[PDB]
Amino acid sequence: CKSPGSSCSPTSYNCCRSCNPYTKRCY
């Protein structure tokens, strides 16, 4: 999975925590 700051999709299902809809970085 990814770290915060990694770039995500609202639900990439690739962030170890979630995404940040206002950066599009993992939360």
mmCIF file with all atom_site columns, C-alpha atoms in Angstrom:
data_model
loop_
_atom_site.group_PDB
_atom_site.id
_atom_site.type_symbol
_atom_site.label_atom_id
_atom_site.label_alt_id
_atom_site.label_comp_id
_atom_site.label_asym_id
_atom_site.label_entity_id
_atom_site.label_seq_id
_atom_site.pdbx_PDB_ins_code
_atom_site.Cartn_x
_atom_site.Cartn_y
_atom_site.Cartn_z
_atom_site.occupancy
_atom_site.B_iso_or_equiv
_atom_site.pdbx_formal_charge
_atom_site.auth_seq_id
_atom_site.auth_comp_id
_atom_site.auth_asym_id
_atom_site.auth_atom_id
_atom_site.pdbx_PDB_model_num
ATOM 1  C CA . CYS A 1 1  ? 0.000   0.000  0.000  1.00 0.00 ? 1  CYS A CA 1
ATOM 2  C CA . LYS A 1 2  ? 1.003   3.683  0.094  1.00 0.00 ? 2  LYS A CA 1
ATOM 3  C CA . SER A 1 3  ? 1.945   6.387  2.526  1.00 0.00 ? 3  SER A CA 1
ATOM 4  C CA . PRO A 1 4  ? 0.170   9.733  2.939  1.00 0.00 ? 4  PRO A CA 1
ATOM 5  C CA . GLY A 1 5  ? 1.405   12.057 0.228  1.00 0.00 ? 5  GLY A CA 1
ATOM 6  C CA . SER A 1 6  ? 1.475   9.168  -2.248 1.00 0.00 ? 6  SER A CA 1
ATOM 7  C CA . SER A 1 7  ? -1.107  10.216 -4.882 1.00 0.00 ? 7  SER A CA 1
ATOM 8  C CA . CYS A 1 8  ? -4.468  8.482  -4.740 1.00 0.00 ? 8  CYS A CA 1
ATOM 9  C CA . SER A 1 9  ? -7.938  8.087  -6.191 1.00 0.00 ? 9  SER A CA 1
ATOM 10 C CA . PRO A 1 10 ? -10.816 8.688  -3.651 1.00 0.00 ? 10 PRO A CA 1
ATOM 11 C CA . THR A 1 11 ? -10.759 4.975  -3.300 1.00 0.00 ? 11 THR A CA 1
ATOM 12 C CA . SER A 1 12 ? -7.433  3.855  -4.901 1.00 0.00 ? 12 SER A CA 1
ATOM 13 C CA . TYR A 1 13 ? -7.475  0.979  -2.348 1.00 0.00 ? 13 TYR A CA 1
ATOM 14 C CA . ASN A 1 14 ? -3.767  1.626  -2.501 1.00 0.00 ? 14 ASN A CA 1
ATOM 15 C CA . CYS A 1 15 ? -3.264  3.867  0.547  1.00 0.00 ? 15 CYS A CA 1
ATOM 16 C CA . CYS A 1 16 ? -2.444  2.231  3.869  1.00 0.00 ? 16 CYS A CA 1
ATOM 17 C CA . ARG A 1 17 ? -4.888  4.724  5.510  1.00 0.00 ? 17 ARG A CA 1
ATOM 18 C CA . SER A 1 18 ? -7.174  6.382  2.884  1.00 0.00 ? 18 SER A CA 1
ATOM 19 C CA . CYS A 1 19 ? -6.875  9.210  0.298  1.00 0.00 ? 19 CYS A CA 1
ATOM 20 C CA . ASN A 1 20 ? -6.874  13.004 0.691  1.00 0.00 ? 20 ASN A CA 1
ATOM 21 C CA . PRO A 1 21 ? -9.573  14.284 -1.695 1.00 0.00 ? 21 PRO A CA 1
ATOM 22 C CA . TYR A 1 22 ? -8.020  17.780 -1.638 1.00 0.00 ? 22 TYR A CA 1
ATOM 23 C CA . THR A 1 23 ? -4.535  16.962 -2.641 1.00 0.00 ? 23 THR A CA 1
ATOM 24 C CA . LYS A 1 24 ? -5.270  13.466 -3.915 1.00 0.00 ? 24 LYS A CA 1
ATOM 25 C CA . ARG A 1 25 ? -2.501  12.234 -1.705 1.00 0.00 ? 25 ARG A CA 1
ATOM 26 C CA . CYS A 1 26 ? -3.047  9.316  0.599  1.00 0.00 ? 26 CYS A CA 1
ATOM 27 C CA . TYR A 1 27 ? -4.511  10.823 3.796  1.00 0.00 ? 27 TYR A CA 1
#
